[PDB]
Amino acid sequence: IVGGYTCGANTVPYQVSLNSGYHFCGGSLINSQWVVSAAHCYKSGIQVRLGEDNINVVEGNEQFISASKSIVHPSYNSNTLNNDIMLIKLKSAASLNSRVASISLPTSCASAGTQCLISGWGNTKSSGTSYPDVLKCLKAPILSDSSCKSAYPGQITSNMFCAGYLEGGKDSCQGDSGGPVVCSGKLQGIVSWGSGCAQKNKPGVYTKVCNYVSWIKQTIASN
């Protein structure tokens, strides 16, 4: 997260860290046994880390649970990042509490101008590399489809939206991939792609979760 602030320990209780001996992606807890993340975060060997603030110190409230399986959207395209969404089933159910809690899926899509909260442990500089120990937060609005398409002509599908700031300085970045975009208490986006980080006229692009609720529900019920 570039241009953001320290969230405060366990203030974003649905945020998870995907770990394979290091933090590589975020995700969101959607019930006690399932996490939503980005398909481009797929790999084998994933440990899900819940209840984290400082990802480099055991502070208390952490739960570490192996992934039992990871379900990449069958129509994910690695070229275009269309359908950049994946479900992860936990080997055992998380213990839900005030510091580890699920986030609601949306019942309708969010409109342009809606203010959202984006969170992650990704890089905090636009030029250079600086990864934080603790969780960072960014408030950002959803942009109109016309502004999104003007920023990335030909590359925006109906399964994507832009969010952020055209004047630059404030964005998600590498290491934030897969994490949540929460608007009015509901999960509306997944950190997906962008052009650099926090560059002028190049806002972040996010998977549009409202297009996948029926797929998520059908997949979880059958697995």
Ligand X SMILES: N=C(N)c1ccc([C@H]2[C@H]3C(=O)N(Cc4ccc5c(c4)OCO5)[C@H](C4CC4)[C@H]3[C@@H]3CCCN32)cc1
Does position 120 bind ligand X by CB under 6 A? Answer: no
Instruction: Report the residue from 63, 172, 188, 207 that binds ligand X according to the rule CB under 6 A.
Output: 172
Question: Phi, psi (5° rounding) for residue 28?
Answer: -130, 135
CA distances (Å), 189 to each of 37, 110, 117, 136, in order? 10, 10, 10, 17
Q: Do the beta carbons of residue 183 and residue 110 sit within 8 Å?
A: yes
Using rule CB under 6 A, residue 52 touches ligand X: no
- Which residues make Cβ contacts (< 8 Å) with residue 5, sequence separation at least 6? 136, 137, 138
84 in catalytic set = yes
Reply yes or no on whether 73 is catalytic: no
Quote the least distance from Cβ 138 to Ca ion, whole Å. Answer: 21
Is 171 a residue that touches ligand X (CB under 6 A)? yes
Structure token digits, residue 41: 């975060």
Residue number with CB closer to Ca ion (69 or 133): 133
In the complex, least distance from residue 96 CB atom to ligand X, rounded to whole angstroms: 29
Query: Closer to ligand X at the Cβ: 63 or 171?
Result: 171
β-bridge mates for residue 17, sequence order:
26, 49
Structure tokens that stand for 222 in this block: 């059958």
Least Å distance, CB 173 to ligand X, is 6
Per-residue binding string, ligand X, 150-169, x by CB under 6 A, is -----x--------------
Give the number of residues written for the chain. 223
With binding defined as CB under 6 A, does residue 191 bind ligand X?
yes
CB atoms within 10 A of CB 10: 19
Q: Does 173 bind ligand X (CB under 6 A)?
A: yes
Sheet with 186-193, strands from edge to edge, namely: 5-6, 136-141, 115-120, 180-183, 186-193, 204-208, 160-163
215: enclosing H helix or E strand = helix 213-221
Interaction pattern, residues 88-107, with ligand X; x per rule: CB under 6 A: --------------------
Annotated binding-site members for substrate: 171-172, 174-175, 177
By CB under 6 A, tell whether 211 contacts ligand X.
no
* Binding test (CB under 6 A) with ligand X, winner from 55, 86, 197, 216: 197
- Choose, from 17, 40, 70, 119, the residue flagged as catalytic: 40
Just list the catalytic residues. Answer: 40, 84, 177
